[PDB]
Amino acid sequence: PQITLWQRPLVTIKIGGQLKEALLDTGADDTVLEEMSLPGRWKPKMIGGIGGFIKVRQYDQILIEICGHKAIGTVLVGPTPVNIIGRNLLTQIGCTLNF
Amino acid sequence: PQITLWQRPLVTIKIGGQLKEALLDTGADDTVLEEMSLPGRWKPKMIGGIGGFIKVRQYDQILIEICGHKAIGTVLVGPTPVNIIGRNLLTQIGCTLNF
Numbered sequence: 001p002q003i004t005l006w007q008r009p010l011v012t013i014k015i016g017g018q019l020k021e022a023l024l025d026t027g028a029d030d031t032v033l034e035e036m037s038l039p040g041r042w043k044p045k046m047i048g049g050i051g052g053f054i055k056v057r058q059y060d061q062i063l064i065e066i067c068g069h070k071a072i073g074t075v076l077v078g079p080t081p082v083n084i085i086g087r088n089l090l091t092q093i094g095c096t097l098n099f
Numbered sequence: 100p101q102i103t104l105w106q107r108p109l110v111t112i113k114i115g116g117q118l119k120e121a122l123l124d125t126g127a128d129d130t131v132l133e134e135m136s137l138p139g140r141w142k143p144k145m146i147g148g149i150g151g152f153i154k155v156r157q158y159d160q161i162l163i164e165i166c167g168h169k170a171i172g173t174v175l176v177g178p179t180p181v182n183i184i185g186r187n188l189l190t191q192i193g194c195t196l197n198f
Contacts, residue, residue, distance in 0.1 A: 001198065002196065002197045002198075003196045003197075004195050004196075005125055005189045005190050005194055005195070005196065006186075006190055007186075008128075008142050008186065009125050009126070009182040009196060011184050015195065017178055021126075023126050024125060025124070025125060025126030025171065026104055026108050026122075026123060026124060026125045026126070026196075027108070027122050027124030027125070027126045027183065028126060028128060029107075048149045049149060050147045050148060050149065050150075050151040050152075050182060051150070051151060052150060053149075064139075067198070068106040078176055083198045084111065084126065086105075087104050087105075087107065090104045090151065090198070091104050091105055093110065095104055095105050095196065095197065096101055096102065096104070096123075096196075096197045096198070097101065097102045097103075097123055097167070097195075097197070098101045098102075098107060098194065098195045098196070098197050099100065099101075099168065099189070099192045099193050099194040099195070
C-alpha cells in the first residue's frame with residue numbers, strides 16, 4: 001500500500017492479536033505504542049515530550065504486523081497519546097519515500 | 100528523488116537564497132525551521148517539546164525549495180534544534196509513502 005500525505009498517515013497495526021492504529025512516522029527513531037500487556041521481557045527505557053522525561057517499557061523482538069506486512073523488531077510501551085511507527089519499522093517493511 | 104528510511108531522512112532546502120537541511124517528516128503537521136531572517140510579515144504562534152511551550156514566529160506564503168522542487172506555503176521560525184518538513188510541504192511536493 002502506497003499512501004499520500006494530504007492528511008495524517010494513520011494505518012492499522014497488530015501487536016499480539018490486538019488490532020491497532022498508528023502514524024507511519026519518518027521523523028522518529030523509535031517505535032512506541034499504547035499501554036497493552038506484552039508476553040515478553042522488558043528493559044526500562046525513557047522518552048519525553050512536552051514536560052519531557054516520561055518512563056517507557058522497551059520490548060525486544062516483537063512481531064508487529066502492519067498494513068498486511070509481517071515485521072519483527074523492537075517496540076516500546078508506555079503512556080503515549082499515539083502509537084507511532086519509527087524508522088526501525090518502516091525500514092523493515094521496505095518502506096520508501098517518493099517525490 | 101525517492102529516499103529510503105535506513106537512516107534519518109535529511110535533505111537540503113532553500114529558504115531565500117540560504118541552502119539548508121531538514122527532515123522529511125510524515126508525522127508533523129507544521130513545518131518549522133532555523134532562526135533565519137525572513138523578508139515578510141509574521142504572526143506569533145506557539146509550539147512545544149520537552150518543557151513544552153516555546154514561542155515561534157509564523158510566516159505565511161514562503162517559497163521553500165526542497166530537493167529540486169519549488170513549493171510555497173507556510174514555514175514557522177524559532178529556536179528549534181532541527182529543521183523539520185511537516186505534512187504541509189511533503190503534501191505539496193507530491194510526496195507519497197511507498198511499501
